[PDB]
């Protein structure tokens, strides 16, 4: 969490290289040891703690938090520490136009709400002609079972990989919780996390903080769900 | 008995309207026998002013169907002929 040896042992400090580089990020750098850039260690955790402050500020306010960043290599922690009743997530490539073309996706979730139940029956290959399409819809639309509204918290684990969702977020005005690296640019993201995406430990120790802060947000929402009707502790 | 109509969704669906409604009244009537089918092709030209190799060809059918009694003792089907004629079935009687 806030502990320093969580930052030291996970592999946060190291960057990509010295030629893969961006001087709009270079304020938040510490050195260039052995031709690999070393990120700053002391400005991270004040920024990192205040990111979880506004996660918990939203999480007790009856809204949604969206987890993205689908890489097949190290995105399985996003597959794992999610999929509960307050946070949607994604599993495949981010579709071009989702927040802005949400009227179409409302029509394409109509197929999703049937083909699970439609496999009750199961001719012979004709059952396989429709049970094949259930795999692709599970691969992309499976993580979103929510319908209605727009997610009030986009948590991007990798900014350099997905400029698609950041553009479609700022067209609508929703907060973006990005995790930038050395090479990626700190523009478009709202609450920055100057961290690293080059280890399974660092991608896990960024996300144990996030799914815990919404449980306490739900524990805070369960603390406050009596405040909605009763006024004596409210 | 012999039957003539234009489509097999009448004439082979009115034999059961006769076989059931005569064997009920005691007399024995055997299974109906098909006959060969009339087939007449009509190749007509299709363009108003001439272009010869564009054509269209039709065909008119006529289904036949023959019943066979064993013991004639029922005038029941003689009254039930307006029932057994429905739209396009013609029945010439051969009460064997």
């Amino acid at each position: 969490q806030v502990n320093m040896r969580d930052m030291l042992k996970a592999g946060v400090h190291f960057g990509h290289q010295t030629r893969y580089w961006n001087p709009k990020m270079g304020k938040f750098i510490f050195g260039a040891r052995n031709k690999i850039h070393i990120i700053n260690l002391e400005k991270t955790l004040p920024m990192f703690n205040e990111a979880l402050t506004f996660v918990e500020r939203l999480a007790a306010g009856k809204n949604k938090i969206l987890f993205v960043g689908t890489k097949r290599s190290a995105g399985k922690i996003v597959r794992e520490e999610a999929a509960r009743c307050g946070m949607p997530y994604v599993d495949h490539r981010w579709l071009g136009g989702m927040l802005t073309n949400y009227k179409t996706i409302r029509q394409s979730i109509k197929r999703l709400r049937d083909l699970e139940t439609q496999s009750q029956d199961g001719t012979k290959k004709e059952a396989l002609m429709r049970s094949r399409d259930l795999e692709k819809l599970e691969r992309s639309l499976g993580g979103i079972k929510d319908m209605g509204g727009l997610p009030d918290a986009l948590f991007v684990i990798d900014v350099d990989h997905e400029r698609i969702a950041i553009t479609e977020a700022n067209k609508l005005g929703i907060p973006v919780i990005g995790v930038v690296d050395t090479n990626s640019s700190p523009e478009g993201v709202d609450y920055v996390i100057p961290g690293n995406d080059d280890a399974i430990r660092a991608v896990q120790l960024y996300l144990n903080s996030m799914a815990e802060a919404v449980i306490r947000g739900k524990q805070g929402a369960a603390t406050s769900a009596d405040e909605f009707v009763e006024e004596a502790p409210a | 008995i012999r039957l003539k109509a234009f489509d097999h969704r009448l004439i082979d669906q009115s034999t059961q309207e006769i076989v059931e409604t005569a064997k009920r009244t005691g007399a024995q009537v055997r299974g109906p026998i098909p006959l060969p089918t009339r087939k007449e092709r009509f190749t007509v030209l299709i363009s108003p002013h001439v272009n010869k190799d564009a054509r269209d060809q039709y065909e008119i059918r006529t289904h036949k169907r023959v019943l066979d009694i064993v013991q004639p003792t029922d005038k029941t089907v003689d009254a039930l002929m307006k029932l057994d004629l429905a739209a396009g079935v013609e029945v010439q009687i051969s009460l064997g």
């Binding site: - | 003539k4 234009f6 307006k82 004629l85 739209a87 396009g88 079935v89 013609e90």
Partner: protein
């Protein structure tokens, strides 16, 4: 080009409008009756819209089922037209004639009834498209799954033969399993002749 959508499905979808067996010596003496009946009846029933006129021949006389969506105009004060025509259909068709009248509830889902209204609107000097954008959505609030309407002809212009084409929904035409209506009624304006085609697609199988 686009062989007629009844002539490919006589069989798997629809049936004939007239069923009667005839010998080879009287086959061409019942057709000439039944073809100048339909030219007679539609010229009399220009109003009280008529879609289908079926003719059966039972034993030795006749039967006719005229379909209207407004039967009260034809049966007016208990058959003042019914017995009047039944006297005078025998004068063209020497057998005694039956006349039977049903209803065409949902009149905006049969193609002849729709396309007669198009000739009425386009001879009242109504706009060629404001008449037809409203004549498809009205036939899509209730019923069909696809409608095409082609309007071809002079269309008001000087030397202009344009074709309006508007479509909604789904209309197949190379599926014999489906069920398609079709009708071509024309229009005589103060200049030119406008022909209208309608392809109301009801449910399949």
């Amino acid at each position: 080009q686009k062989v007629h959508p009844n002539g490919i499905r006589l069989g798997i979808v629809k049936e004939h409008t007239s069923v009667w067996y005839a010998d080879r010596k009287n086959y061409a003496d019942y057709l000439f009756a039944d073809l100048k009946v339909r030219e007679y009846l539609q010229d009399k029933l220009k109003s009280a819209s008529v879609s289908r006129i079926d003719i059966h021949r039972p034993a030795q006389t006749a039967r006719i089922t005229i379909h209207t969506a407004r039967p009260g105009i034809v049966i007016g004060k208990k058959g003042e037209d019914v017995e009047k025509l039944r006297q005078d259909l025998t004068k063209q068709m020497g057998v005694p004639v039956h006349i039977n009248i049903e209803e065409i509830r949902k009149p905006e889902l049969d193609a002849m009834l729709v396309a007669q209204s198009v000739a009425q609107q386009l001879e009242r000097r109504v706009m060629f498209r404001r008449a037809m954008k409203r004549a498809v959505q009205n036939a899509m609030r209730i019923g069909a799954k696809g409608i095409k309407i082609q309007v071809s002809g002079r269309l008001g212009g000087a030397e202009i033969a344009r074709t309006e084409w508007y479509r909604e929904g789904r209309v197949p035409l190379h599926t014999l399993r489906a069920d398609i209506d079709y009708a071509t009624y024309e229009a005589h304006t103060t200049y030119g002749v406008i022909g209208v085609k309608v392809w109301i697609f009801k449910g399949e199988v």
